[PDB]
Design a protein around this ligand. Structure first.
Ligand SMILES: [NH3+]Cc1cn([C@@H]2[C@@H](O[C@H]3C[C@H](C(=O)NCc4ccc(CO)cc4)[C@@H](C(=O)NCc4ccc(CO)cc4)C[C@@H]3OCCCl)O[C@H](CO)[C@@H](O)[C@@H]2O)nn1
Ligand SMILES: [Ca+2]
Ligand SMILES: [Ca+2]
Ligand SMILES: [Ca+2]
Ligand SMILES: [Cl-]
Ligand SMILES: [Cl-]
Ligand SMILES: [Cl-]
Length: 132
């Protein structure tokens, strides 16, 4: 009984996969679903801190499961839930700014940025640990 699939990282009752290759946002959604997971939806400050670290330390741009594709200005996680006000602090300064039409959220530096969905970035999938 392993809490997570091999090579995935356990953190606080969930399993995370950190890609070692780059995909646009819609194809990153697909990849996560092919392994029974979701392009990462953040639920807490501690989780955000953990995820952000992965990117700030590796200097990689990394997609999360957050977008405003459906309605410009309305940021919605891929699980249907809306971006809570307490989380808007994590945007980088001046973001999100929709410049050139940017409807997908990424880890970038110390915070989040909106970027163009058809660019190729690393990605992180999330799913529940198994019970042990
Ligand atoms: N993690 C990658 C990243 C990407 N960001 C974007 C980046 O955007 C810039 C850079 C953007 C860009 O991709 N430019 C083309 C470009 C590509 C590659 C090079 C490398 O030589 C140079 C230029 C630029 C842009 O989106 N232009 C297209 C466009 C078309 C039409 C309109 C009007 O509807 C607007 C825009 C926009 C920004 O230029 C600022 C001065 Cl260079 O920086 C902003 C913070 O300032 C962020 O908010 C953005 O999301 N920040 N970080
Ligand atoms: Ca749009
Ligand atoms: Ca947008
Ligand atoms: Ca932006
Ligand atoms: Cl832990
Ligand atoms: Cl990968
Ligand atoms: Cl770590």
């Amino acid at each position: 009984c392993h809490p997570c699939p091999w090579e995935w990282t356990f953190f606080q009752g969930n399993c995370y996969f950190m890609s070692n290759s780059q995909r646009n946002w819609h194809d990153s959604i697909t990849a996560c679903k092919e392994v029974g997971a979701q392009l990462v939806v953040i639920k807490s400050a501690e989780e955000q801190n953990f995820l952000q670290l992965q990117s700030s330390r590796s200097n990689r741009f990394t997609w999360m499961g957050l977008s405003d594709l459906n309605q410009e200005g309305t940021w919605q996680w891929v699980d249907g839930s809306p971006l809570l006000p307490s989380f808007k602090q994590y945007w980088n300064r001046g973001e999100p700014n929709n410049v050139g039409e940017e409807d997908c959220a990424e880890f970038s530096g110390n915070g989040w940025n909106d970027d163009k969905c058809n660019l190729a970035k690393f990605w992180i999938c999330k799913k529940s640990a198994a019970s042990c």
